[PDB]
Design an enzyme around this catalytic site. Sequence first.
Site, PDB file in Angstrom:
ATOM      1  N   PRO A 165       0.890  -1.512  -0.411  1.00 41.02           N
ATOM      2  CA  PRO A 165       0.237  -0.013   0.101  1.00 41.02           C
ATOM      3  C   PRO A 165       0.704   1.147  -0.190  1.00 41.02           C
ATOM      4  CG  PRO A 165       0.067  -0.615   2.276  1.00 41.02           C
ATOM      5  CD  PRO A 165       0.387  -1.892   1.289  1.00 41.02           C
ATOM      6  N   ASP A 166       0.465   1.877  -0.864  1.00 41.83           N
ATOM      7  CA  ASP A 166       1.204   3.582  -0.631  1.00 41.83           C
ATOM      8  C   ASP A 166       0.371   4.857   0.666  1.00 41.83           C
ATOM      9  OD1 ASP A 166      -1.477   4.672  -1.358  1.00 41.83           O
ATOM     10  OD2 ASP A 166      -1.231   5.204  -2.979  1.00 41.83           O
ATOM     11  N   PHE A 167       0.907   5.636   0.869  1.00 41.22           N
ATOM     12  CA  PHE A 167       0.069   6.890   1.574  1.00 41.22           C
ATOM     13  C   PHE A 167      -1.075   7.649   1.327  1.00 41.22           C
ATOM     14  CE2 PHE A 167       4.435   8.640   3.104  1.00 41.22           C
ATOM     15  CZ  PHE A 167       4.721   7.338   3.809  1.00 41.22           C
ATOM     16  N   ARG A 168      -1.052   8.609   0.224  1.00 38.02           N
ATOM     17  CA  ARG A 168      -2.582   8.851   0.182  1.00 38.02           C
ATOM     18  C   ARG A 168      -3.336   8.900  -0.434  1.00 38.02           C
ATOM     19  NH1 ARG A 168       2.735  12.058   1.039  1.00 38.02           N
ATOM     20  NH2 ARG A 168       2.350  14.000   1.650  1.00 38.02           N
ATOM     21  N   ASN A 212      10.967   4.594  -2.526  1.00 38.26           N
ATOM     22  CA  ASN A 212      10.647   3.137  -2.548  1.00 38.26           C
ATOM     23  C   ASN A 212      11.277   1.951  -1.282  1.00 38.26           C
ATOM     24  OD1 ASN A 212       8.113   3.777  -3.279  1.00 38.26           O
ATOM     25  ND2 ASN A 212       8.595   2.367  -5.057  1.00 38.26           N
ATOM     26  N   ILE A 213      11.289   1.554  -0.890  1.00 42.50           N
ATOM     27  CA  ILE A 213      12.184   1.720   0.280  1.00 42.50           C
ATOM     28  C   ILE A 213      12.022  -0.832  -0.183  1.00 42.50           C
ATOM     29  CG2 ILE A 213      11.951   3.119   1.719  1.00 42.50           C
ATOM     30  CD1 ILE A 213       9.521   0.626   3.004  1.00 42.50           C
ATOM     31  N   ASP A 214      11.381  -0.723  -0.607  1.00 40.45           N
ATOM     32  CA  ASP A 214      11.149  -2.387  -1.080  1.00 40.45           C
ATOM     33  C   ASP A 214      11.651  -2.895  -1.506  1.00 40.45           C
ATOM     34  OD1 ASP A 214      10.330  -1.805  -3.434  1.00 40.45           O
ATOM     35  OD2 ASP A 214       8.031  -1.290  -3.204  1.00 40.45           O
ATOM     36  N   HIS A 261      15.249   7.197   0.243  1.00 41.29           N
ATOM     37  CA  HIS A 261      14.638   7.060   1.225  1.00 41.29           C
ATOM     38  C   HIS A 261      15.686   6.308   2.238  1.00 41.29           C
ATOM     39  CE1 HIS A 261      11.816   9.966  -0.091  1.00 41.29           C
ATOM     40  NE2 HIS A 261      12.528  10.716   0.030  1.00 41.29           N
ATOM     41  N   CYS A 293      21.752  -0.355  14.365  1.00 40.85           N
ATOM     42  CA  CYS A 293      21.522   0.374  15.399  1.00 40.85           C
ATOM     43  C   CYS A 293      21.712   1.318  15.704  1.00 40.85           C
ATOM     44  CB  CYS A 293      22.691  -0.464  16.698  1.00 40.85           C
ATOM     45  SG  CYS A 293      22.984   0.490  18.348  1.00 40.85           S
ATOM     46  N   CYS A 339      29.184   2.259  18.197  1.00 44.13           N
ATOM     47  CA  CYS A 339      28.401   0.817  17.667  1.00 44.13           C
ATOM     48  C   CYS A 339      27.845   0.725  15.769  1.00 44.13           C
ATOM     49  CB  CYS A 339      27.815   0.044  18.439  1.00 44.13           C
ATOM     50  SG  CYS A 339      26.948  -1.337  18.676  1.00 44.13           S
ATOM     51  N   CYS A 382      25.227  -3.557  22.275  1.00 47.19           N
ATOM     52  CA  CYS A 382      25.307  -2.809  22.703  1.00 47.19           C
ATOM     53  C   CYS A 382      23.613  -2.425  23.429  1.00 47.19           C
ATOM     54  CB  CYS A 382      25.657  -1.278  21.743  1.00 47.19           C
ATOM     55  SG  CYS A 382      24.564  -0.708  20.741  1.00 47.19           S
ATOM     56  N   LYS A 399      -2.448   7.306 -10.889  1.00 49.54           N
ATOM     57  CA  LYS A 399      -3.563   7.707 -11.462  1.00 49.54           C
ATOM     58  C   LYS A 399      -4.257   9.383 -11.516  1.00 49.54           C
ATOM     59  CE  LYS A 399      -4.401   2.737  -9.327  1.00 49.54           C
ATOM     60  NZ  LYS A 399      -5.193   2.262  -7.863  1.00 49.54           N
ATOM     61  N   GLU A 400      -3.761   9.872 -10.571  1.00 51.32           N
ATOM     62  CA  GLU A 400      -3.412  10.768 -10.816  1.00 51.32           C
ATOM     63  C   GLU A 400      -2.494  12.054 -11.163  1.00 51.32           C
ATOM     64  OE1 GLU A 400      -2.732  10.031  -8.063  1.00 51.32           O
ATOM     65  OE2 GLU A 400      -2.769  11.153  -6.240  1.00 51.32           O
TER      66      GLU A 400
HETATM   67  N1  LIG Z   1       6.486   0.663  -1.914  1.00 51.33           N
HETATM   68  C1  LIG Z   1       7.368   1.119  -0.945  1.00 51.33           C
HETATM   69  O1  LIG Z   1       8.722   1.102  -0.812  1.00 51.33           O
HETATM   70  C2  LIG Z   1       6.397   2.751  -0.060  1.00 51.33           C
HETATM   71  C3  LIG Z   1       5.078   1.796   0.510  1.00 51.33           C
HETATM   72  C4  LIG Z   1       4.515   3.239   1.096  1.00 51.33           C
HETATM   73  C5  LIG Z   1       5.081   4.091   1.384  1.00 51.33           C
HETATM   74  N2  LIG Z   1       6.559   4.740   0.632  1.00 51.33           N
HETATM   75  C6  LIG Z   1       6.969   6.051   1.012  1.00 51.33           C
HETATM   76  C7  LIG Z   1       5.841   6.868   0.335  1.00 51.33           C
HETATM   77  C8  LIG Z   1       6.451   8.534   0.181  1.00 51.33           C
HETATM   78  C9  LIG Z   1       5.992   8.810  -0.998  1.00 51.33           C
HETATM   79  O2  LIG Z   1       5.638   9.017  -1.909  1.00 51.33           O
HETATM   80  P1  LIG Z   1       4.935   8.493  -2.557  1.00 51.33           P
HETATM   81  O3  LIG Z   1       5.431   7.777  -3.971  1.00 51.33           O
HETATM   82  O4  LIG Z   1       4.615  10.341  -3.552  1.00 51.33           O
HETATM   83  O5  LIG Z   1       3.771   7.649  -1.511  1.00 51.33           O
HETATM   84  P2  LIG Z   1       2.582   8.520  -2.502  1.00 51.33           P
HETATM   85  O6  LIG Z   1       1.101   7.856  -1.742  1.00 51.33           O
HETATM   86  O7  LIG Z   1       2.246  10.055  -1.517  1.00 51.33           O
HETATM   87  O8  LIG Z   1       1.418   8.796  -3.857  1.00 51.33           O
HETATM   88  C10 LIG Z   1       1.072   8.050  -4.931  1.00 51.33           C
HETATM   89  C11 LIG Z   1       0.609   7.865  -5.667  1.00 51.33           C
HETATM   90  O9  LIG Z   1       0.778   6.670  -7.209  1.00 51.33           O
HETATM   91  C12 LIG Z   1      -0.570   7.402  -7.327  1.00 51.33           C
HETATM   92  N3  LIG Z   1      -0.702   5.371  -7.447  1.00 51.33           N
HETATM   93  C13 LIG Z   1      -0.972   4.320  -6.448  1.00 51.33           C
HETATM   94  N4  LIG Z   1      -1.276   3.199  -7.004  1.00 51.33           N
HETATM   95  C14 LIG Z   1      -1.012   3.177  -8.750  1.00 51.33           C
HETATM   96  C15 LIG Z   1      -1.054   2.870  -9.300  1.00 51.33           C
HETATM   97  N5  LIG Z   1      -1.477   1.187  -8.927  1.00 51.33           N
HETATM   98  N6  LIG Z   1      -0.440   2.475 -10.878  1.00 51.33           N
HETATM   99  C16 LIG Z   1      -0.592   4.256 -10.855  1.00 51.33           C
HETATM  100  N7  LIG Z   1      -0.637   4.920 -10.345  1.00 51.33           N
HETATM  101  C17 LIG Z   1      -0.907   4.823  -8.634  1.00 51.33           C
HETATM  102  C18 LIG Z   1      -1.267   7.481  -5.778  1.00 51.33           C
HETATM  103  O10 LIG Z   1      -2.046   7.787  -6.585  1.00 51.33           O
HETATM  104  C19 LIG Z   1      -0.245   8.638  -5.523  1.00 51.33           C
HETATM  105  O11 LIG Z   1      -0.663  10.070  -6.705  1.00 51.33           O
HETATM  106  C20 LIG Z   1       8.049   7.528   0.118  1.00 51.33           C
HETATM  107  O12 LIG Z   1       9.382   8.357   0.499  1.00 51.33           O
HETATM  108  C21 LIG Z   1       8.062   5.973   0.054  1.00 51.33           C
HETATM  109  O13 LIG Z   1       9.075   5.844   0.378  1.00 51.33           O
HETATM  110  C22 LIG Z   1       6.547   3.617   0.343  1.00 51.33           C
HETATM  111 ZN   LIG Z   2      24.779  -1.817  18.868  1.00 49.23          ZN
END
Ligand SMILES: NC(=O)c1ccc[n+]([C@@H]2C[C@H](COP(=O)(O)OP(=O)(O)OC[C@H]3O[C@@H](n4cnc5c(N)ncnc54)[C@H](O)[C@@H]3O)[C@@H](O)[C@H]2O)c1
Ligand SMILES: [Zn+2]
Lengths: 289, 5
Positions: A41-44, A114-116, A133, A141, A146, A170, A233-234
């Site tokens: 899942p994402d953030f927004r 992303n961090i995945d 990121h 740690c 350390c 530690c 998506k937007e």
């Molecule tokens: N996979 C991960 O590592 C992960 C997961 C969750 C949050 N994050 C952090 C969230 C943070 C902000 O990054 P950001 O990408 O702007 O997150 P965000 O949540 O702010 O925005 C994500 C954007 O991608 C769009 N979106 C989501 N799914 C899809 C899809 N299938 N196709 C097209 N568009 C899509 C969504 O509408 C939104 O505009 C980063 O620093 C990440 O480290 C990372």
């Molecule tokens: Zn340590």
Amino acid sequence: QKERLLDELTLEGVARYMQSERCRRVICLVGAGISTSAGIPDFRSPTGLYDNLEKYHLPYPEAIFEISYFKKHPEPFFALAKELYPGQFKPTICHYFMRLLKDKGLLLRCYTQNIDTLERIAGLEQEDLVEAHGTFYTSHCVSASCRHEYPLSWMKEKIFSEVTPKCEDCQSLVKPDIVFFGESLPARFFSCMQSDFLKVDLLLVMGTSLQVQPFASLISKAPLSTPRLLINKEKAGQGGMDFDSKKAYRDVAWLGECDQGCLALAELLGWKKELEDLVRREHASIDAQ
Amino acid sequence: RAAXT
Ligand SMILES: NC(=O)c1ccc[n+]([C@@H]2C[C@H](COP(=O)(O)OP(=O)(O)OC[C@H]3O[C@@H](n4cnc5c(N)ncnc54)[C@H](O)[C@@H]3O)[C@@H](O)[C@H]2O)c1
Ligand SMILES: [Zn+2]
């Protein structure tokens, strides 16, 4: 100045530009949107993390990803990590589109929020990547004296045993090598940014809302003539993105799923079969373990 | 506007 390189502000125009001799170096900027189809899942997004953090009773959502709060109260983060960790990491069609860009000799760099680690798994080398990121892959740690490193397996055993990861030496808190809000981005980010963008011929921005700084401002680092394609998506990024004003001359927004956008672009380039083969082969290799 | 300095 603002030279016009695209014939039309469309995905078709972008493809035609990519097929031209002028387009040699592509930089990808990607976010959580390119991994949502993988199950993360994402953030927004209205499914997004920020809509489901009620059970953690945070002063505010972003606090769960803020370094001060994490150091004081790491438990919510690790609980969320226990809940969100996928059964398996597989890269999406988008990741492999970037891999294909690498194989075609077009990929200058991928900057990822992303961090995945899905970019690494998709076959992008460390040289090809700027993990802006950080990453969940390795952990350290928090003690300055350390700084003990811990692998993903150790961390996953800690997380799934619902034990807050502590250094076995530690006893300090062990934190994934993620850049939390309030922390500094790695030096590689800034050095690579200083070198790469003076020679980028195309900016491909995928699956990000461009809200987090200083990453978003990368879009303003490109030369004014460099075309910028958003697959999301937007619309986002509105030296910001200008898709619809009368002064629009280089920015293109393709709205929809990232995987579908990459499939469409690949098709326009005659790469669809190649992409699908790449994805299926790599997925099969991963499944074979 | 969230920030990682
Ligand atoms: N996979 C991960 O590592 C992960 C997961 C969750 C949050 N994050 C952090 C969230 C943070 C902000 O990054 P950001 O990408 O702007 O997150 P965000 O949540 O702010 O925005 C994500 C954007 O991608 C769009 N979106 C989501 N799914 C899809 C899809 N299938 N196709 C097209 N568009 C899509 C969504 O509408 C939104 O505009 C980063 O620093 C990440 O480290 C990372
Ligand atoms: Zn340590």
